[PDB]
């Protein structure tokens, strides 16, 4: 029949990875090849474990902390990274054993306590700001710059910043920006010639971690497709292209205090 | 869930909703043309999205009322509970060569590289009505189209109606039941998103059309169209306002019929 079905190559999984990237690219330019001695990351939703791995080689030690255990299944079986419970980081540190003269902090809304936080002395602290678009009630409950307080003084302060240039999304989190991506994609594609409808790919799949603590099911869900098409005419490369002009509208910097 | 201050809210709409929405908007149209006329025989070509609906709503002025597609897995859509005949094509052209059968209503819902002009030239019905598949103007769309060309054999001596259906201030590419459906939840995901408080919303869509097509599943077919249509990841309770905004935009959708 004159109808054709074509799912892109771009996975759900592949966007992700790429916000990941330029994430990672704007912590590398702020930091301008440093080294340290020991790095604390908390948060390993969505980022926190690409990070570790890339800033290992900048470091002598770095721990990867989160509140809880089961995240632990997405830091691989290497030693060029410890992932830490919370409560486990907070153990070594009142026993003196942790140190870190590099901390970041991925955890965004409700996340790690600026009193906590005040606690350490780094020689660099970056924090990522949560927020995306004006919006009344986000500002409210974010407190990104209470965590940067205890460290203007005395330590350089960075504040990670991601957005879509000239499109809304709600927050910078790796999650909302793919999500935003992909549909916006999808109603770009719909536009192309010959085609009747696009339909983005995508499904709730914090659930599967918070509330179903399975990370492989995750790790399943997030390889889809990112885009589904019902076509005249064969669209692929033109929607590849859709996408990759869509993830290339976001930017990541990192502003210092 | 991920944070103590964040909420993950699902519609109560479900997708299944907003597609019987667009099929009842659509049957509307259908009967405000049709005025109430009582017919001996109605034939309805093309079962899928809304011609099961269609036969069940005519079949209160009709004394027999046959379903007929191409495909015959597609019986799986008509419930055991009625008097619609289902016929695939073939059985129902066996059934033309024996002269059993010669409706005064046809309804050819086919679509796109649907029914064929020559083989509607063998009727002789009282009222013609034919979906027109398209949406906004595509190149590619329009040529492919020939509702016009099956409305030809039957100018002369029946009504002849032609049923139109788009989005208000909206671009959609088709008017079919599950393009329009796709095109209304995904928008409105994208309104829902802009509420003060809200984090993403997900429009929960799937591919719903090859679970018929090709794995012929029309259980699965209907579990899975049966989902919540949006999930929201969200500050505030926004359940009432998402219903809303849902609201709005199915409400944008027109279906009228054309007389020729
Ligand atoms: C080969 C052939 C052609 C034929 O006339 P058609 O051009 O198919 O259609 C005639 C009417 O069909 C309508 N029509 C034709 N093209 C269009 C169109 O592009 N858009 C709309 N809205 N209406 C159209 C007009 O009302 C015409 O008066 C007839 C009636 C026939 O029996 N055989
Ligand atoms: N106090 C805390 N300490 C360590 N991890 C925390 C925490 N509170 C929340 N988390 C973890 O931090 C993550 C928050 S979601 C953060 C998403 C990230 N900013 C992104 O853009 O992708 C989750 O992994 C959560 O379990
Ligand atoms: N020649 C033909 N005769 C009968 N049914 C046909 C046909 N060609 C396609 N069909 C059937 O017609 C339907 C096409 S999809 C039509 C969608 C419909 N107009 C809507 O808006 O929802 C399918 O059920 C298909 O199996």
Redesign the pocket.
């Known amino acids: 029949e004159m109808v054709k079905t074509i799912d892109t190559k771009t996975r759900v999984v592949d966007v992700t990875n790429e916000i990941a990237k330029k994430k990672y690219q704007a912590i590398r330019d702020f930091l301008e090849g440093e080294e340290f001695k020991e790095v604390v990351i908390?948060?390993?939703?969505?980022?926190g474990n690409y990070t570790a791995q890339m800033l290992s080689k900048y470091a002598d030690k770095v721990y990867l902390?989160?509140?809880?255990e089961f995240?632990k299944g997405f830091v691989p079986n290497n030693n060029s990274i410890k992932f830490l419970n919370?409560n486990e980081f907070k153990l070594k540190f009142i026993r003196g054993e942790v140190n870190p003269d590099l901390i970041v902090d991925?955890?965004?809304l409700g996340?790690?306590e600026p009193e906590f936080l005040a606690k350490f002395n780094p020689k660099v602290f970056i924090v990522?700001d949560?927020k995306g678009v004006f919006d009344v009630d986000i500002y409210e409950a974010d407190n990104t710059y209470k965590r940067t307080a205890p460290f203007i003084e005395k330590a350089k302060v960075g504040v990670l910043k991601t957005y879509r240039k000239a499109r809304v999304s709600k927050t910078?989190?790796?999650?909302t920006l793919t999500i935003d991506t992909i549909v916006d994609a999808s109603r770009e594609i719909t536009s192309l010639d010959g085609v009747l409808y696009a339909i983005p790919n995508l499904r709730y799949y914090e659930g599967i971690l918070f509330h179903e603590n399975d990370i492989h099911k995750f790790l399943s869900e997030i390889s889809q497709p990112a885009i589904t098409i019902s076509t005249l005419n064969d669209v692929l490369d033109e929607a590849e292209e859709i996408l990759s002009n869509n993830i290339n509208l976001i930017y990541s910097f990192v502003e210092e205090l």
Do not use: A, K, Q
Request: net charge negative; aromatic share 14%.
């Open positions: 908390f948060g390993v939703y969505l980022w902390v989160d509140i809880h995240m919370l991925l955890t965004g996340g790690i990522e949560p910078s989190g790796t999650m």
